[PDB]
Amino acid sequence: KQLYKQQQSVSGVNLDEEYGNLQRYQQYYLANAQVLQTANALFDALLNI
Amino acid sequence: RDQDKQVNIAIGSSVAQINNYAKQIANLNDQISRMTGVGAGASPNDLLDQR
Amino acid sequence: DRALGQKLQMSNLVDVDWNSVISSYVMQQAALQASYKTFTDMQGMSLFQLNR
Amino acid sequence: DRALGQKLQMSNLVDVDWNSVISSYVMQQAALQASYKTFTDMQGM
Amino acid sequence: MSSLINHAMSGLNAAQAALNTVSNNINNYNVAGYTRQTTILAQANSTLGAGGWIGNGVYVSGVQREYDAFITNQLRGAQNQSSGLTTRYEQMSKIDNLLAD
């Protein structure tokens, strides 16, 4: 049992760091999408000229 | 006994990726020098990071 | 009687002292939930506030 | 007493340990909740 | 250049892929045999314009397996003993139970 748990320590999903990561990367994805809209406004202004 | 043996395996594992790391740093030297050669002072951000 | 004394001394060397451990257990439980709350809420508000 | 021994030896094979299964049951329920939250977020995209 | 949109699409794709990976860490969780998988990120390739920090975006450089050999292999023998000596004791119990009283 001890050695199985020692294997799990490295291998086993810890479920906390991953959950926090899930949030962290949603933020990143939103950051990307919004940035696209800004470039859209930029070439909108250029087009409207 | 066997866990000291496995400590010996870990030593080889450590050396194993050291070789390749050194190799890619050599490649990075090559490319960074080349890019500055053409760059006139401008250089690649990404390669300076990677080094 | 000597044996009883000996196992008493053994105990001494190894204590549950149930009450101390579970009191600090509750303290740590509250601290844990507090820290997690900090992470979730703060991180959260700041994300969609900043993205906007 | 022979029959008693047989009776318990059968339990060794067939029976289920309540504690292990209930623990795994709760843990997998938590895993389900995790998977469902994952899905609803990813679909939120 | 189409850089303006391309930066965003690169980052968006990379984020989505990393999302899949972290999910894969979640979706399995309980099932034995799995090991946690971790992800790599790095800059985009050098269509460097004319030099300088024209990095053009990002990409995910695959996923890594958190895996081992010198405790992984060492695990098999311990499991072997667990079965064998446990069984030696367990069979004797098969008998002593009958004949003890």
PDB file of C-alpha atoms in Angstrom:
ATOM      1  CA  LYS A   1       0.000   0.000   0.000  1.00  0.00           C
ATOM      2  CA  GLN A   2       2.800   2.411   0.916  1.00  0.00           C
ATOM      3  CA  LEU A   3       4.650   1.987  -2.367  1.00  0.00           C
ATOM      4  CA  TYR A   4       1.452   2.212  -4.416  1.00  0.00           C
ATOM      5  CA  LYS A   5       0.732   5.508  -2.685  1.00  0.00           C
ATOM      6  CA  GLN A   6       4.293   6.655  -3.354  1.00  0.00           C
ATOM      7  CA  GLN A   7       3.692   5.996  -7.048  1.00  0.00           C
ATOM      8  CA  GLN A   8       0.395   7.878  -6.819  1.00  0.00           C
ATOM      9  CA  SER A   9       2.113  10.859  -5.199  1.00  0.00           C
ATOM     10  CA  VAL A  10       3.829  11.705  -8.474  1.00  0.00           C
ATOM     11  CA  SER A  11       1.364  10.074 -10.847  1.00  0.00           C
ATOM     12  CA  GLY A  12      -1.982  10.698  -9.168  1.00  0.00           C
ATOM     13  CA  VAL A  13      -4.189  13.589 -10.268  1.00  0.00           C
ATOM     14  CA  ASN A  14      -4.309  15.978  -7.300  1.00  0.00           C
ATOM     15  CA  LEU A  15      -7.583  17.656  -8.278  1.00  0.00           C
ATOM     16  CA  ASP A  16      -6.762  20.972  -6.634  1.00  0.00           C
ATOM     17  CA  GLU A  17      -3.961  22.362  -8.768  1.00  0.00           C
ATOM     18  CA  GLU A  18      -5.829  21.137 -11.830  1.00  0.00           C
ATOM     19  CA  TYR A  19      -9.068  22.824 -10.746  1.00  0.00           C
ATOM     20  CA  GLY A  20      -7.237  26.092 -10.171  1.00  0.00           C
ATOM     21  CA  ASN A  21      -5.608  25.642 -13.563  1.00  0.00           C
ATOM     22  CA  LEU A  22      -8.988  25.146 -15.225  1.00  0.00           C
ATOM     23  CA  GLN A  23     -10.033  28.603 -14.032  1.00  0.00           C
ATOM     24  CA  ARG A  24      -6.680  30.170 -14.896  1.00  0.00           C
ATOM     25  CA  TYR A  25      -6.858  29.064 -18.526  1.00  0.00           C
ATOM     26  CA  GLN A  26     -10.472  30.117 -19.018  1.00  0.00           C
ATOM     27  CA  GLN A  27      -9.174  33.588 -18.227  1.00  0.00           C
ATOM     28  CA  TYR A  28      -6.460  33.185 -20.855  1.00  0.00           C
ATOM     29  CA  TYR A  29      -8.973  32.060 -23.472  1.00  0.00           C
ATOM     30  CA  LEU A  30     -11.173  35.074 -22.762  1.00  0.00           C
ATOM     31  CA  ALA A  31      -8.145  37.355 -22.976  1.00  0.00           C
ATOM     32  CA  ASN A  32      -7.398  36.007 -26.441  1.00  0.00           C
ATOM     33  CA  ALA A  33     -10.947  36.319 -27.755  1.00  0.00           C
ATOM     34  CA  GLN A  34     -11.367  39.897 -26.557  1.00  0.00           C
ATOM     35  CA  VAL A  35      -8.038  40.925 -28.081  1.00  0.00           C
ATOM     36  CA  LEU A  36      -9.345  39.776 -31.457  1.00  0.00           C
ATOM     37  CA  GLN A  37     -12.264  42.200 -31.134  1.00  0.00           C
ATOM     38  CA  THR A  38      -9.819  45.051 -30.568  1.00  0.00           C
ATOM     39  CA  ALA A  39      -7.997  44.337 -33.815  1.00  0.00           C
ATOM     40  CA  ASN A  40     -11.458  44.253 -35.356  1.00  0.00           C
ATOM     41  CA  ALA A  41     -12.078  47.791 -34.115  1.00  0.00           C
ATOM     42  CA  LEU A  42      -8.693  48.884 -35.469  1.00  0.00           C
ATOM     43  CA  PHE A  43      -9.306  47.742 -39.011  1.00  0.00           C
ATOM     44  CA  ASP A  44     -12.917  48.901 -38.685  1.00  0.00           C
ATOM     45  CA  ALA A  45     -11.604  52.428 -38.195  1.00  0.00           C
ATOM     46  CA  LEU A  46      -9.142  51.983 -41.051  1.00  0.00           C
ATOM     47  CA  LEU A  47     -11.934  50.762 -43.350  1.00  0.00           C
ATOM     48  CA  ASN A  48     -14.349  53.539 -42.402  1.00  0.00           C
ATOM     49  CA  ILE A  49     -11.820  56.196 -43.503  1.00  0.00           C
TER      50      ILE A  49
ATOM     51  CA  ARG B   1      19.844  -3.113  -1.884  1.00  0.00           C
ATOM     52  CA  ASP B   2      17.386  -2.678  -4.733  1.00  0.00           C
ATOM     53  CA  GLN B   3      16.562   0.946  -3.979  1.00  0.00           C
ATOM     54  CA  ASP B   4      20.259   1.856  -4.093  1.00  0.00           C
ATOM     55  CA  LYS B   5      20.353   0.015  -7.412  1.00  0.00           C
ATOM     56  CA  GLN B   6      17.442   2.170  -8.557  1.00  0.00           C
ATOM     57  CA  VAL B   7      19.332   5.234  -7.338  1.00  0.00           C
ATOM     58  CA  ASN B   8      22.005   4.104  -9.783  1.00  0.00           C
ATOM     59  CA  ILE B   9      19.433   4.027 -12.594  1.00  0.00           C
ATOM     60  CA  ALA B  10      18.337   7.558 -11.696  1.00  0.00           C
ATOM     61  CA  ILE B  11      21.928   8.694 -12.251  1.00  0.00           C
ATOM     62  CA  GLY B  12      21.878   7.418 -15.824  1.00  0.00           C
ATOM     63  CA  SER B  13      18.460   8.946 -16.424  1.00  0.00           C
ATOM     64  CA  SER B  14      19.815  12.304 -15.269  1.00  0.00           C
ATOM     65  CA  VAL B  15      22.802  12.195 -17.624  1.00  0.00           C
ATOM     66  CA  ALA B  16      20.555  11.058 -20.474  1.00  0.00           C
ATOM     67  CA  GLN B  17      18.647  14.303 -20.995  1.00  0.00           C
ATOM     68  CA  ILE B  18      21.701  16.415 -20.127  1.00  0.00           C
ATOM     69  CA  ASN B  19      23.192  15.279 -23.420  1.00  0.00           C
ATOM     70  CA  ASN B  20      20.236  16.499 -25.471  1.00  0.00           C
ATOM     71  CA  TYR B  21      19.866  19.755 -23.562  1.00  0.00           C
ATOM     72  CA  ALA B  22      23.476  20.607 -24.378  1.00  0.00           C
ATOM     73  CA  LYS B  23      22.841  19.736 -28.030  1.00  0.00           C
ATOM     74  CA  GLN B  24      19.890  22.098 -28.371  1.00  0.00           C
ATOM     75  CA  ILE B  25      21.851  24.873 -26.691  1.00  0.00           C
ATOM     76  CA  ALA B  26      24.490  24.423 -29.394  1.00  0.00           C
ATOM     77  CA  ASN B  27      21.780  24.761 -32.037  1.00  0.00           C
ATOM     78  CA  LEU B  28      20.514  27.903 -30.293  1.00  0.00           C
ATOM     79  CA  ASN B  29      24.015  29.381 -30.335  1.00  0.00           C
ATOM     80  CA  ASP B  30      24.154  28.782 -34.080  1.00  0.00           C
ATOM     81  CA  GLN B  31      20.778  30.332 -34.811  1.00  0.00           C
ATOM     82  CA  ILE B  32      21.077  33.330 -32.468  1.00  0.00           C
ATOM     83  CA  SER B  33      24.478  34.251 -33.880  1.00  0.00           C
ATOM     84  CA  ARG B  34      23.094  33.962 -37.414  1.00  0.00           C
ATOM     85  CA  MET B  35      20.045  36.106 -36.635  1.00  0.00           C
ATOM     86  CA  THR B  36      22.141  38.853 -35.054  1.00  0.00           C
ATOM     87  CA  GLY B  37      24.489  38.644 -38.032  1.00  0.00           C
ATOM     88  CA  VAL B  38      21.651  39.580 -40.351  1.00  0.00           C
ATOM     89  CA  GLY B  39      19.887  41.645 -37.709  1.00  0.00           C
ATOM     90  CA  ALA B  40      22.039  44.787 -37.513  1.00  0.00           C
ATOM     91  CA  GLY B  41      21.356  44.754 -33.770  1.00  0.00           C
ATOM     92  CA  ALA B  42      17.784  43.510 -34.042  1.00  0.00           C
ATOM     93  CA  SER B  43      17.425  39.925 -32.869  1.00  0.00           C
ATOM     94  CA  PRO B  44      14.797  37.234 -32.194  1.00  0.00           C
ATOM     95  CA  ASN B  45      12.993  37.629 -28.881  1.00  0.00           C
ATOM     96  CA  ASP B  46      11.981  33.969 -28.837  1.00  0.00           C
ATOM     97  CA  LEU B  47      15.504  32.581 -29.194  1.00  0.00           C
ATOM     98  CA  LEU B  48      16.931  34.957 -26.590  1.00  0.00           C
ATOM     99  CA  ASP B  49      14.208  33.639 -24.293  1.00  0.00           C
ATOM    100  CA  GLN B  50      14.852  29.995 -25.148  1.00  0.00           C
ATOM    101  CA  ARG B  51      18.597  30.214 -24.564  1.00  0.00           C
TER     102      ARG B  51
ATOM    103  CA  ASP C   1       2.789  -2.505  38.890  1.00  0.00           C
ATOM    104  CA  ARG C   2       6.116  -1.859  37.203  1.00  0.00           C
ATOM    105  CA  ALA C   3       4.556  -2.850  33.875  1.00  0.00           C
ATOM    106  CA  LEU C   4       1.696  -0.418  34.386  1.00  0.00           C
ATOM    107  CA  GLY C   5       4.207   2.335  35.060  1.00  0.00           C
ATOM    108  CA  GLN C   6       6.139   1.369  31.947  1.00  0.00           C
ATOM    109  CA  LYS C   7       3.151   1.540  29.631  1.00  0.00           C
ATOM    110  CA  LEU C   8       2.254   4.870  31.181  1.00  0.00           C
ATOM    111  CA  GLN C   9       5.721   6.117  30.221  1.00  0.00           C
ATOM    112  CA  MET C  10       5.228   4.680  26.735  1.00  0.00           C
ATOM    113  CA  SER C  11       1.988   6.573  26.411  1.00  0.00           C
ATOM    114  CA  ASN C  12       3.774   9.710  27.424  1.00  0.00           C
ATOM    115  CA  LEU C  13       6.089   9.256  24.522  1.00  0.00           C
ATOM    116  CA  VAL C  14       3.167   8.941  22.151  1.00  0.00           C
ATOM    117  CA  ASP C  15       0.084  11.135  22.672  1.00  0.00           C
ATOM    118  CA  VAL C  16      -3.243  11.624  20.958  1.00  0.00           C
ATOM    119  CA  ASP C  17      -4.228  14.134  23.623  1.00  0.00           C
ATOM    120  CA  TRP C  18      -7.364  13.905  21.634  1.00  0.00           C
ATOM    121  CA  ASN C  19      -8.553  17.334  22.607  1.00  0.00           C
ATOM    122  CA  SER C  20      -5.565  19.368  21.438  1.00  0.00           C
ATOM    123  CA  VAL C  21      -5.393  17.536  18.128  1.00  0.00           C
ATOM    124  CA  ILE C  22      -9.067  17.935  17.278  1.00  0.00           C
ATOM    125  CA  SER C  23      -9.183  21.576  18.394  1.00  0.00           C
ATOM    126  CA  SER C  24      -6.260  22.408  16.114  1.00  0.00           C
ATOM    127  CA  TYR C  25      -7.972  20.174  13.552  1.00  0.00           C
ATOM    128  CA  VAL C  26     -10.992  22.483  13.506  1.00  0.00           C
ATOM    129  CA  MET C  27      -8.738  25.544  13.398  1.00  0.00           C
ATOM    130  CA  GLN C  28      -6.918  24.170  10.365  1.00  0.00           C
ATOM    131  CA  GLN C  29     -10.222  23.236   8.729  1.00  0.00           C
ATOM    132  CA  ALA C  30     -11.445  26.825   8.952  1.00  0.00           C
ATOM    133  CA  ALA C  31      -8.097  28.093   7.680  1.00  0.00           C
ATOM    134  CA  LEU C  32      -8.244  25.712   4.709  1.00  0.00           C
ATOM    135  CA  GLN C  33     -11.684  26.804   3.610  1.00  0.00           C
ATOM    136  CA  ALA C  34     -10.679  30.448   4.074  1.00  0.00           C
ATOM    137  CA  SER C  35      -7.601  30.106   1.863  1.00  0.00           C
ATOM    138  CA  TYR C  36      -9.552  28.361  -0.864  1.00  0.00           C
ATOM    139  CA  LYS C  37     -12.216  31.076  -0.721  1.00  0.00           C
ATOM    140  CA  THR C  38      -9.490  33.675  -1.120  1.00  0.00           C
ATOM    141  CA  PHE C  39      -8.172  32.003  -4.256  1.00  0.00           C
ATOM    142  CA  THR C  40     -11.514  31.450  -5.962  1.00  0.00           C
ATOM    143  CA  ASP C  41     -13.174  34.766  -5.249  1.00  0.00           C
ATOM    144  CA  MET C  42     -10.243  37.110  -5.740  1.00  0.00           C
ATOM    145  CA  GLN C  43      -8.965  35.418  -8.813  1.00  0.00           C
ATOM    146  CA  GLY C  44     -12.423  35.338 -10.141  1.00  0.00           C
ATOM    147  CA  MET C  45     -13.563  38.900  -9.768  1.00  0.00           C
ATOM    148  CA  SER C  46     -10.315  40.218 -11.093  1.00  0.00           C
ATOM    149  CA  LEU C  47     -10.478  38.110 -14.241  1.00  0.00           C
ATOM    150  CA  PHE C  48     -13.730  39.311 -15.747  1.00  0.00           C
ATOM    151  CA  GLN C  49     -13.232  42.787 -14.307  1.00  0.00           C
ATOM    152  CA  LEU C  50      -9.887  43.130 -16.073  1.00  0.00           C
ATOM    153  CA  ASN C  51     -10.925  41.405 -19.295  1.00  0.00           C
ATOM    154  CA  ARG C  52     -13.611  44.079 -19.530  1.00  0.00           C
TER     155      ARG C  52
ATOM    156  CA  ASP D   1     -18.841 -25.827  13.219  1.00  0.00           C
ATOM    157  CA  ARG D   2     -17.844 -27.206   9.811  1.00  0.00           C
ATOM    158  CA  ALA D   3     -20.885 -25.442   8.383  1.00  0.00           C
ATOM    159  CA  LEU D   4     -19.981 -22.210  10.148  1.00  0.00           C
ATOM    160  CA  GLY D   5     -16.505 -22.311   8.639  1.00  0.00           C
ATOM    161  CA  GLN D   6     -17.976 -22.911   5.194  1.00  0.00           C
ATOM    162  CA  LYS D   7     -20.454 -20.081   5.734  1.00  0.00           C
ATOM    163  CA  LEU D   8     -17.762 -17.517   6.480  1.00  0.00           C
ATOM    164  CA  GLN D   9     -15.424 -18.813   3.785  1.00  0.00           C
ATOM    165  CA  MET D  10     -18.190 -18.195   1.261  1.00  0.00           C
ATOM    166  CA  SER D  11     -18.453 -14.594   2.450  1.00  0.00           C
ATOM    167  CA  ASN D  12     -14.724 -14.273   1.803  1.00  0.00           C
ATOM    168  CA  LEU D  13     -15.403 -14.898  -1.890  1.00  0.00           C
ATOM    169  CA  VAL D  14     -18.803 -13.398  -2.598  1.00  0.00           C
ATOM    170  CA  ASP D  15     -19.420 -10.635  -0.098  1.00  0.00           C
ATOM    171  CA  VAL D  16     -18.629  -6.925  -0.420  1.00  0.00           C
ATOM    172  CA  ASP D  17     -16.921  -4.706   2.158  1.00  0.00           C
ATOM    173  CA  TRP D  18     -19.338  -1.856   2.877  1.00  0.00           C
ATOM    174  CA  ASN D  19     -16.654   0.653   3.820  1.00  0.00           C
ATOM    175  CA  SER D  20     -14.500   0.375   0.702  1.00  0.00           C
ATOM    176  CA  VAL D  21     -17.480   0.573  -1.644  1.00  0.00           C
ATOM    177  CA  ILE D  22     -19.132   3.519   0.105  1.00  0.00           C
ATOM    178  CA  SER D  23     -15.839   5.414   0.081  1.00  0.00           C
ATOM    179  CA  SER D  24     -15.312   4.727  -3.621  1.00  0.00           C
ATOM    180  CA  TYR D  25     -18.964   5.621  -4.223  1.00  0.00           C
ATOM    181  CA  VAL D  26     -18.647   9.067  -2.666  1.00  0.00           C
ATOM    182  CA  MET D  27     -15.319   9.668  -4.398  1.00  0.00           C
ATOM    183  CA  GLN D  28     -16.722   8.778  -7.814  1.00  0.00           C
ATOM    184  CA  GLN D  29     -19.710  11.013  -7.125  1.00  0.00           C
ATOM    185  CA  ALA D  30     -17.235  13.841  -6.582  1.00  0.00           C
ATOM    186  CA  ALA D  31     -15.503  12.857  -9.815  1.00  0.00           C
ATOM    187  CA  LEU D  32     -18.866  13.025 -11.594  1.00  0.00           C
ATOM    188  CA  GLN D  33     -19.463  16.534 -10.315  1.00  0.00           C
ATOM    189  CA  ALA D  34     -15.974  17.459 -11.504  1.00  0.00           C
ATOM    190  CA  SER D  35     -16.646  16.059 -14.964  1.00  0.00           C
ATOM    191  CA  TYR D  36     -19.996  17.839 -15.218  1.00  0.00           C
ATOM    192  CA  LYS D  37     -18.542  21.191 -14.217  1.00  0.00           C
ATOM    193  CA  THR D  38     -15.796  20.568 -16.759  1.00  0.00           C
ATOM    194  CA  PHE D  39     -18.359  19.939 -19.472  1.00  0.00           C
ATOM    195  CA  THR D  40     -20.505  22.961 -18.696  1.00  0.00           C
ATOM    196  CA  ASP D  41     -17.476  25.263 -18.636  1.00  0.00           C
ATOM    197  CA  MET D  42     -15.963  23.886 -21.840  1.00  0.00           C
ATOM    198  CA  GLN D  43     -19.334  24.313 -23.521  1.00  0.00           C
ATOM    199  CA  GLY D  44     -19.393  27.836 -22.133  1.00  0.00           C
ATOM    200  CA  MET D  45     -16.178  28.329 -24.131  1.00  0.00           C
TER     201      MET D  45
ATOM    202  CA  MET E   1       0.832  41.171 -42.380  1.00  0.00           C
ATOM    203  CA  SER E   2      -2.162  39.264 -41.040  1.00  0.00           C
ATOM    204  CA  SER E   3      -0.368  39.314 -37.694  1.00  0.00           C
ATOM    205  CA  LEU E   4      -3.092  41.122 -35.765  1.00  0.00           C
ATOM    206  CA  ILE E   5      -5.599  38.289 -36.077  1.00  0.00           C
ATOM    207  CA  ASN E   6      -2.956  35.563 -36.149  1.00  0.00           C
ATOM    208  CA  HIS E   7      -1.605  36.344 -32.683  1.00  0.00           C
ATOM    209  CA  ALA E   8      -5.125  36.002 -31.301  1.00  0.00           C
ATOM    210  CA  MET E   9      -5.921  32.789 -33.150  1.00  0.00           C
ATOM    211  CA  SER E  10      -2.625  31.213 -32.089  1.00  0.00           C
ATOM    212  CA  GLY E  11      -3.251  32.006 -28.440  1.00  0.00           C
ATOM    213  CA  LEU E  12      -6.884  30.926 -28.700  1.00  0.00           C
ATOM    214  CA  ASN E  13      -5.959  27.552 -30.196  1.00  0.00           C
ATOM    215  CA  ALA E  14      -3.204  26.999 -27.647  1.00  0.00           C
ATOM    216  CA  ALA E  15      -5.536  27.840 -24.773  1.00  0.00           C
ATOM    217  CA  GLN E  16      -8.199  25.467 -26.059  1.00  0.00           C
ATOM    218  CA  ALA E  17      -5.686  22.635 -26.433  1.00  0.00           C
ATOM    219  CA  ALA E  18      -4.296  23.180 -22.944  1.00  0.00           C
ATOM    220  CA  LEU E  19      -7.913  23.130 -21.779  1.00  0.00           C
ATOM    221  CA  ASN E  20      -8.361  19.701 -23.336  1.00  0.00           C
ATOM    222  CA  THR E  21      -5.218  18.488 -21.585  1.00  0.00           C
ATOM    223  CA  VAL E  22      -6.201  19.676 -18.119  1.00  0.00           C
ATOM    224  CA  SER E  23      -9.622  18.153 -18.723  1.00  0.00           C
ATOM    225  CA  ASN E  24      -7.924  14.847 -19.509  1.00  0.00           C
ATOM    226  CA  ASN E  25      -6.313  15.138 -16.094  1.00  0.00           C
ATOM    227  CA  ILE E  26      -9.814  15.580 -14.661  1.00  0.00           C
ATOM    228  CA  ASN E  27     -11.830  13.120 -16.747  1.00  0.00           C
ATOM    229  CA  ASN E  28      -9.735  10.117 -15.729  1.00  0.00           C
ATOM    230  CA  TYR E  29      -8.894  11.084 -12.121  1.00  0.00           C
ATOM    231  CA  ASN E  30     -10.254   8.041 -10.302  1.00  0.00           C
ATOM    232  CA  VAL E  31      -9.328   5.226 -12.703  1.00  0.00           C
ATOM    233  CA  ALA E  32      -6.158   3.362 -11.735  1.00  0.00           C
ATOM    234  CA  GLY E  33      -3.352   3.148 -14.285  1.00  0.00           C
ATOM    235  CA  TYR E  34      -3.436   6.773 -15.391  1.00  0.00           C
ATOM    236  CA  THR E  35      -0.711   9.291 -14.646  1.00  0.00           C
ATOM    237  CA  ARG E  36      -1.073  13.060 -14.638  1.00  0.00           C
ATOM    238  CA  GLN E  37      -0.271  14.667 -17.995  1.00  0.00           C
ATOM    239  CA  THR E  38       1.277  18.139 -18.193  1.00  0.00           C
ATOM    240  CA  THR E  39       1.525  20.542 -21.118  1.00  0.00           C
ATOM    241  CA  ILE E  40       4.241  22.624 -22.811  1.00  0.00           C
ATOM    242  CA  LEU E  41       3.958  26.113 -24.344  1.00  0.00           C
ATOM    243  CA  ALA E  42       6.403  28.133 -26.444  1.00  0.00           C
ATOM    244  CA  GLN E  43       6.702  30.999 -28.914  1.00  0.00           C
ATOM    245  CA  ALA E  44       5.626  30.740 -32.540  1.00  0.00           C
ATOM    246  CA  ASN E  45       8.128  30.106 -35.304  1.00  0.00           C
ATOM    247  CA  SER E  46      10.214  32.954 -36.695  1.00  0.00           C
ATOM    248  CA  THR E  47       8.550  34.534 -39.632  1.00  0.00           C
ATOM    249  CA  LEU E  48      10.518  37.314 -38.025  1.00  0.00           C
ATOM    250  CA  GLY E  49       9.576  40.090 -40.433  1.00  0.00           C
ATOM    251  CA  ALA E  50      12.851  42.021 -40.485  1.00  0.00           C
ATOM    252  CA  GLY E  51      14.190  41.000 -37.064  1.00  0.00           C
ATOM    253  CA  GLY E  52      13.465  42.159 -33.555  1.00  0.00           C
ATOM    254  CA  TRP E  53      10.704  40.868 -31.321  1.00  0.00           C
ATOM    255  CA  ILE E  54       8.257  39.973 -34.108  1.00  0.00           C
ATOM    256  CA  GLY E  55       7.298  36.676 -32.465  1.00  0.00           C
ATOM    257  CA  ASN E  56       3.983  36.066 -34.212  1.00  0.00           C
ATOM    258  CA  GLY E  57       2.354  34.165 -31.350  1.00  0.00           C
ATOM    259  CA  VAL E  58       2.477  30.850 -29.508  1.00  0.00           C
ATOM    260  CA  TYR E  59       1.902  27.104 -29.704  1.00  0.00           C
ATOM    261  CA  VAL E  60       1.594  24.125 -27.365  1.00  0.00           C
ATOM    262  CA  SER E  61       4.664  21.873 -27.619  1.00  0.00           C
ATOM    263  CA  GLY E  62       2.865  18.625 -26.894  1.00  0.00           C
ATOM    264  CA  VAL E  63       2.004  17.007 -23.576  1.00  0.00           C
ATOM    265  CA  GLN E  64       4.344  15.287 -21.117  1.00  0.00           C
ATOM    266  CA  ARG E  65       3.704  12.060 -19.200  1.00  0.00           C
ATOM    267  CA  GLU E  66       4.642  12.117 -15.513  1.00  0.00           C
ATOM    268  CA  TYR E  67       6.156   8.644 -15.667  1.00  0.00           C
ATOM    269  CA  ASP E  68       8.966   6.693 -14.034  1.00  0.00           C
ATOM    270  CA  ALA E  69      10.970   3.492 -14.438  1.00  0.00           C
ATOM    271  CA  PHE E  70      13.186   2.857 -11.399  1.00  0.00           C
ATOM    272  CA  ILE E  71      10.261   2.889  -9.005  1.00  0.00           C
ATOM    273  CA  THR E  72       7.821   1.793 -11.730  1.00  0.00           C
ATOM    274  CA  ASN E  73       9.714  -1.432 -12.405  1.00  0.00           C
ATOM    275  CA  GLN E  74      10.468  -1.839  -8.690  1.00  0.00           C
ATOM    276  CA  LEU E  75       6.688  -1.938  -8.160  1.00  0.00           C
ATOM    277  CA  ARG E  76       6.211  -5.287  -9.920  1.00  0.00           C
ATOM    278  CA  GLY E  77       8.319  -7.297  -7.476  1.00  0.00           C
ATOM    279  CA  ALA E  78       6.611  -5.861  -4.410  1.00  0.00           C
ATOM    280  CA  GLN E  79       3.202  -6.730  -5.873  1.00  0.00           C
ATOM    281  CA  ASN E  80       4.550 -10.216  -6.577  1.00  0.00           C
ATOM    282  CA  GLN E  81       5.465 -10.701  -2.923  1.00  0.00           C
ATOM    283  CA  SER E  82       2.135  -9.214  -1.842  1.00  0.00           C
ATOM    284  CA  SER E  83       0.318 -11.917  -3.779  1.00  0.00           C
ATOM    285  CA  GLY E  84       2.608 -14.806  -2.909  1.00  0.00           C
ATOM    286  CA  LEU E  85       3.280 -14.517   0.812  1.00  0.00           C
ATOM    287  CA  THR E  86      -0.277 -13.342   1.418  1.00  0.00           C
ATOM    288  CA  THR E  87      -1.439 -16.510  -0.322  1.00  0.00           C
ATOM    289  CA  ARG E  88       0.868 -18.759   1.710  1.00  0.00           C
ATOM    290  CA  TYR E  89      -0.636 -17.316   4.882  1.00  0.00           C
ATOM    291  CA  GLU E  90      -4.127 -17.362   3.375  1.00  0.00           C
ATOM    292  CA  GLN E  91      -4.102 -21.036   2.403  1.00  0.00           C
ATOM    293  CA  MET E  92      -2.833 -22.109   5.828  1.00  0.00           C
ATOM    294  CA  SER E  93      -5.802 -20.165   7.182  1.00  0.00           C
ATOM    295  CA  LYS E  94      -7.849 -22.258   4.756  1.00  0.00           C
ATOM    296  CA  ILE E  95      -6.909 -25.267   6.890  1.00  0.00           C
ATOM    297  CA  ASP E  96      -6.121 -24.230  10.467  1.00  0.00           C
ATOM    298  CA  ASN E  97      -9.685 -22.914  10.729  1.00  0.00           C
ATOM    299  CA  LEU E  98     -10.950 -26.475  10.261  1.00  0.00           C
ATOM    300  CA  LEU E  99      -8.566 -28.261  12.582  1.00  0.00           C
ATOM    301  CA  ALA E 100      -7.919 -25.855  15.466  1.00  0.00           C
ATOM    302  CA  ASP E 101     -10.674 -26.788  17.917  1.00  0.00           C
TER     303      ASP E 101
END
